Write a protein that binds this ligand. Structure first.
Ligand code: OXL
Ligand code: OXL
Ligand code: CL
Ligand code: MG
Ligand code: MG
Ligand code: MG
Lengths: 216, 218
């Protein structure tokens, strides 16, 4: 079932630079097409699993994002058909080792250690598509230890969800249960061991995660 | 329930790739080896088993072949020591890390992800599964690759800068590996372009071979 998509889904695709105010806080520039990177299936941390800090970062950031879960195999589809391939949604955190990412960008290296480590994708319960007639009218929020740190409106996305789906599908075929993370609004920032993150989509879902270090 | 490793590309979730693992490839790229292997990812839909085409992306004019040994995981592998790492291997496959090299040069220059260069649909042509029992030492293999009958790449897995047990241990500490995940262990020298309708043949001497046609989609 899609209600447990993180258990069997193979691929995670992430969009970068999709909120103008996040682009500004990063001091980057918006390109003509969305930036894409990948996370492995073992990046998923469903509720009840910890956010795990990698030992090689001293600057682990939260990033609040809407995930789009695919309901059917999606290969090179037009924008106008792209929503037909969506099964539903989930709220994700694109946990990011920001210090590692800065080095990767500077040296022209892959973004893997910065973005694609174990438990780098905390994920909410699945929200069926029927509950979200317009994914560009959602409000996202995130708290650390009870204090609000990120909020965003999906109406602020530079690239629309039907564009993202179509764009990704032409580069990488998407299977049933693959997710696309659609980028973070402004307000990214560090977390430390034992922080409690609470996050949600207003009116639809919330989730709580503890930041931990590996006990192995 | 469980599915056979003989068809790992059909159900396996993740592809992890090592960069800069053969000194003579590093030289031809004019790069440098770091203290640790470079890692990048491919999606499950990068897999092109025999009988499927290599698909050229529309956005490249310089699609390169890269000949690599793949290590297929047989058991869930989380943060394991080097000395235990081979216990987690199920077997092997020969892969091509198809690379849009023009796109990769731009990505490096702009500090962007290597995704469009490395991680597109059909970017991982893959041989038949070779069970671990047939390869007691994966660092004593000879790899070869032909384009239209002409030899273009050959390599010896003894030349790997980082060993397979090191790579598995290193990767497992960063990214937990599931049963049926593959690790591509890097290319020897001789990478080069292919064009539409080229025939690629490749093999591990004495163990496996495979043939792929280069096509454009639909
Ligand atoms: O680059 C990113 O990850 C983003 O914009 O969310
Ligand atoms: O960087 C690479 O792809 C390699 O060395 O195989
Ligand atoms: Cl990358
Ligand atoms: Mg995957
Ligand atoms: Mg992000
Ligand atoms: Mg390679």
């Amino acid at each position: 079932p899609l209600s447990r998509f993180w258990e069997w889904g193979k691929n995670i695709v992430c969009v970068g630079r999709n909120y103008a105010d996040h682009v500004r806080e990063m001091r980057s520039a918006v390109l003509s097409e969305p930036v894409l990177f990948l996370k492995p299936s073992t990046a998923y941390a469903p509720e009840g699993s910890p956010i795990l800090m990698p030992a090689y970062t001293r600057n682990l950031h939260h990033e609040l994002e809407l995930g789009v879960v695919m309901g059917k195999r999606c290969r090179a589809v037009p924008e106008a058909a792209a929503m037909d391939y969506v099964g539903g949604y989930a709220l994700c955190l694109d946990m990011t080792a920001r210090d590692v990412q800065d080095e990767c960008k500077k040296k022209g290296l892959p973004w893997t250690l910065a973005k694609s480590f174990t438990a780098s994708c905390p994920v909410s319960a699945f929200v069926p598509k029927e509950k979200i007639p317009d994914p560009h009218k959602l409000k996202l929020w995130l708290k650390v230890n009870g204090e609000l740190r990120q909020e965003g409106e999906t109406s602020s996305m530079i690239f629309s969800i039907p564009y993202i789906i179509s764009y990704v599908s032409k580069i990488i075929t998407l299977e049933e249960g693959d997710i696309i993370l659609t980028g973070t609004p402004k307000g990214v920032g560090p977390v430390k061991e034992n922080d409690e993150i609470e996050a949600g989509i207003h009116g639809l879902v919330s989730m709580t995660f503890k930041v931990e270090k590996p006990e192995y």
